[PDB]
């Protein structure tokens, strides 16, 4: 019945998570954002078939080339300096169906390799990845996925743990 | 075409620029310049409030000015008692993303907000012994960002919509829809009389609405950023500001003109809340730098300084007769100068 | 009198909520981001 | 399309327009008055001691 914050309970492994779907709030994100100084990591989402044959509602607005701004934006803010970002990749199947047909080419001016779908998906990664200028304090967990693959979880229950470890070695001054 | 219609709301804003250049005979400053200042305002804390876990997003005095009621990124809600650290209720709430608070003047209920996009009313009188929810009031689109009890059965709310409504706690369907503003509207704050209310959002401008006849009779500017409170002189006839350009403002309704700023080369954090005292000789703002500051309205000069948070402060008040001055900030802790 | 049962009713307040603060802080909070029309509803399953 | 809302602009501005307007110099003569009336009764301006104050310990 509400709106707003969307929020999701689950176990595993004896940890309990608390997700937030605050995506339908629909307007200014600067005078909420920092409502949210203190979450342990931020799960990104990026679909991999946008990499072309889909703009958005517009002529020269590429999906990923808007994805890759809010990714900016959100890695760089005030607020979020020590906190950590899992970003997944789905639909990966779509990507090496379109791959034969319509190369990464179209997407960004220079190369992708093989034109190949091992060769684009790590470039793609590497070109999302560097986007990132806090890397002294922040770090980055890529993990291809699809609508078939279910391991997700535990790459999430996996990264918490280690963001969990390093934060109390960064406090207890030994990292 | 359109064009037509663009030059003659510019020929209007002209002649409102015009006629509002005409009434300046004066400044506010020439007239109180030979009077007596105040001097230095000395100010240290008398009561301490422990008890939250979490940053604190908002206060309320009571209308007899003993008790409070405070709201934290928890689900939780404590009515305070000034007069002896003693805490009366404490109320937990389905979302924990509270971001304002308001008590009613009879003493019976509070409300809530934030970004679930809904206001909840709680029985605080006696219902058996225990609290529990009243109503919830649906319809707004974006968050909830103030509001404020006209009585025990009207309540004014401003959203993130950019518009601001006037509910029916008995039937719980808004009655009046105040439209007009462009931006996320972020303060509200109610005259004496209870017959005309102002607001303020992230597109700088100020609107004077009335409860009746729901329409805008007058649009006061003069900022350059988002402003994020608001609150009337005691006499009604005026009100002011604070932005996130550091700067204070005062506006008066008849002349239809700014008076004063209040502002200062060492600021550059902008204010998070504003407040008159009785008489409107003292102006209360709190800053982002950990810091509270007195100014004279008359004057604009300062007069006092408060410390006592380590974290920015996000809320403050002044007592109805106005004997004592409460702050919250963003750790979890409150204080009372006196 | 009144000023003891209110010390009293304080006591068990700060009581219930070191229980729920303590109680809450075992939980990892995720904040879940996202461009539009791109998923985060088949992560949700 | 957007030619209605720019009617309603105008029929705003147009209400906002036909105002009354005091002084500048009055205002301030009446925000100085009431300042000065109740300046007598303003515990933030004056501190009394111990006696009216509930926050004394």
Known sequence: KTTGIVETHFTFKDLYFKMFDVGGQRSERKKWIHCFEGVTAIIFCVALSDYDLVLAEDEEMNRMHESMKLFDSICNNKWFTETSIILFLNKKDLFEEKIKRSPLTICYPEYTGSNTYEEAAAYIQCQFEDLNRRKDTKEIYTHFTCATDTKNVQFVFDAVTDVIIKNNLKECGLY | ELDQLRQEAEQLKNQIRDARKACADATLSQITNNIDPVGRIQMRTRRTLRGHLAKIYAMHWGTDSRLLVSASQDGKLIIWDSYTTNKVHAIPLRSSWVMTCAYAPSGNYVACGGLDNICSIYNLKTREGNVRVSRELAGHTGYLSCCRFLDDNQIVTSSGDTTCALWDIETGQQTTTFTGHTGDVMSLSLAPDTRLFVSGACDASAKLWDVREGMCRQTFTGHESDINAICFFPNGNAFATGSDDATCRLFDLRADQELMTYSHDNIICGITSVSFSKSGRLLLAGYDDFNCNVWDALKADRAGVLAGHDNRVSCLGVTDDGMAVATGSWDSFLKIWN | AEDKAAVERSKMIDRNLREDGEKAAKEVKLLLLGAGESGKSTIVK | ?57
Do not use: G
């Not at chain 4, 307007?21 to 205002?27: D, G, L, P, Q, T």
């Not at chain 4, 003569?29 to 509930?54: F, G, I, Q, R, W």
């Open chain 4, 1 to 57: 399309a957007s030619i209605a809302q720019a009617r309603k602009l105008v029929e705003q501005l147009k209400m906002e327009a036909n105002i009354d307007r005091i002084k500048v110099s009055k205002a301030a003569a009446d925000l100085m008055a009431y300042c000065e009336a109740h300046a007598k009764e303003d515990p933030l301006l004056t501190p009394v001691p111990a006696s009216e104050n509930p926050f004394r310990e």
